[PDB]
Scaffold this active site. Sequence first.
Site, short mmCIF file in Angstrom:
data_model
loop_
_atom_site.label_atom_id
_atom_site.label_comp_id
_atom_site.label_asym_id
_atom_site.label_seq_id
_atom_site.Cartn_x
_atom_site.Cartn_y
_atom_site.Cartn_z
N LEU A 159 0.89 -1.34 0.01
CA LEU A 159 0.10 -0.11 -0.04
C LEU A 159 0.85 1.37 0.00
O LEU A 159 0.53 2.31 -0.53
N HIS A 160 2.17 1.09 0.66
CA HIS A 160 2.88 2.34 0.40
C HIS A 160 4.01 1.81 -0.81
O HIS A 160 5.27 1.63 -0.59
N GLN A 161 3.49 1.84 -1.96
CA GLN A 161 4.05 1.38 -3.11
C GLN A 161 5.15 2.49 -3.72
O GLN A 161 6.20 2.22 -4.08
N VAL A 175 7.69 1.55 -1.34
CA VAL A 175 8.08 0.16 -1.56
C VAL A 175 8.66 -0.05 -2.59
O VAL A 175 9.57 -0.85 -2.95
#
Lengths: 87, 293, 297
Positions: free
Chosen positions: A20-22, A25
């Site tokens: 979700l923190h791409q 990430v």
Amino acid sequence: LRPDPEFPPAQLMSVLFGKLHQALVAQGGDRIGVSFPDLDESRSRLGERLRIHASADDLRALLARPWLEGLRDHLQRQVSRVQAKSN
Amino acid sequence: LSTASVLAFERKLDPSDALMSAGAWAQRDASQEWPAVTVREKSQTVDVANLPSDADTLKVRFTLRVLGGAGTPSACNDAAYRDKLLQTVATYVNDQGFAELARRYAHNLANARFLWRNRVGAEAVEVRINHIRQGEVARAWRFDALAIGLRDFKADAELDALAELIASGLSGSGHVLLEVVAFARIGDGQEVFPSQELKTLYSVRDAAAIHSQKIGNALRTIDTWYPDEDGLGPIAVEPYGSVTSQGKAYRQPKQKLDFYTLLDNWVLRDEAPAVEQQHYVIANLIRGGVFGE
Amino acid sequence: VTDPEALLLLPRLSIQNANAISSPLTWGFPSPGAFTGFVHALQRRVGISLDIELDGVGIVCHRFEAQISQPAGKRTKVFNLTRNPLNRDGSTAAIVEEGRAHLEVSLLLGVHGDGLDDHPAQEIARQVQEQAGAMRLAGGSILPWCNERFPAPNAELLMLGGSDEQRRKNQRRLTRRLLPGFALVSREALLQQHLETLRTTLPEATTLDALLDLQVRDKPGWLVPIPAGYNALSPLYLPGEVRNARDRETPLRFVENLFGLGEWLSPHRVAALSDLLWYHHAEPDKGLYRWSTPRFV
RNA sequence: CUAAGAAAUUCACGGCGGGCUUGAUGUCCGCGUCUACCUG
């Protein structure tokens, strides 16, 4: 991570971290850092708000991707996001 | 005079077991046929559920049946209590209908909140709701979930047209049957999360599924009427309204804002609370259950 | 006669070959005058060094097996016998018998001493329990420990510590290890009430006690006849005029027994654990000697 | 400072032969188990 009834307290921040923190990430870029703004690092549950501590144009210009989109349901020593931590 | 010993309430707003499927985006007009998703093993092993590699959009389908006749107890023990209860519910209904409660139900129908852990990560979630009178469709609806706030209470034309239908169903005028489908573009091969079973998944006709009572829980996150702190916003309506994911227990009986004390002084001493609490006590009578001593 | 301050508890006292007769009339549990005198011997061997004072005992009787049999006859029981050594001629011996018992108790004492501050509250129970594993307590030896799990650690409670809820909490925190026994306490009250009810036929006290255990009638518990001290009949003597005494410092009085009746409670239905500490009221004013438990009810 | 102090019961043994437990039976008849629920 606001008060949500569905996800866990430690579940939503763990979901919006690398997947979700791409942008945090698989965003692309080694001129920033994900620092804990209020993470209590003495109780093993240190997720409050992962601030993207970056430069001026790195965190202000190179961080406007859609990875922050879809977060309206919940949004509103030297150790960082590397391979050195016990969770 | 006094209260009732054993009360039960047959539930209303009855959902079903949602089956799941797959497919490609912009092929979703032909969604009566899609190859269903099967559970697979961790090849100690456990069971996961994953989309096919060619497919990227989850499709979740279930049906919702609205019964109506709210205040009628399915089991009682005293007519002097039962006539008082039905009188009070009737006086609630003729003042204002279920229309506020109906649009609060239709909001949770509007945004795909029943996709519990599959909502996040998606970027284009579109539901389609067909109210049917016969085997054919009778009234269609096609929303967009992410354009509607998960905490924002809007007032649209289509959502109010849905809300008047649901309120007419709750009052007990006609027959309601909504064949709810929900498309979520999640991406290729992402881990769809169905319900969990004793440690395994939940298939019915060899296809993964959500439990019925989980969707029935998700359909009644309407309680914004906290005594404590409205930063959480909506919550699933419960007596002693509790959250297992966060461990709290709002509407404590030390306060006078629980369900049972509200019903007690609302039907016996006839002390009417606020409209924002009459909404809560009626919404808890909708989900039904076992009340009384 | 006064209040206790610390309930020193011995954890598990396995006893081998102790006495069983204990009177001319009973044969059951040994006379708790032995348990009265045992802690006075314990204080006389220890309590002057650690500066304490011991007065009362409770009994719990974790188990009790006598040595009896019946030679295919009556339901009355005959006793165990011990082979005696030969005489000077080496022929036989005029054998005189007595009963035996394998009883297993764990007494709880009562401390009055000031020496609880200078000495820590576990050393004073690690020395007393270590001393009493080298002495006799009814006529039988005290056994050591096997090689298994160990309840051989004792405790040491202070009843003055904490509030009333804390007292009633640590009381259960002590009684949780003492449960499977049966505490025994005096019952001097109801005899002098049952007397006037039974005064129409005959007022002899032994008859009142003998028919308080013999449709059928009701017994409101587990009544039991015990010795309760000694009545004296001979006057005082001089310390240094009697022949064949154990010493020559104390006077002597010839005595007969004094029979009373007790009760075998459970440890739960007692009010508190300062109600079963066996003191010994000892009025010598041409009187007698008893050993009882005041604040019994 | 204990109804305290004290104590080797031992040796040997052929239980053993025989048996008919039979006969018959009616267990009947009536019944509302409901209301709910997030397993990460």
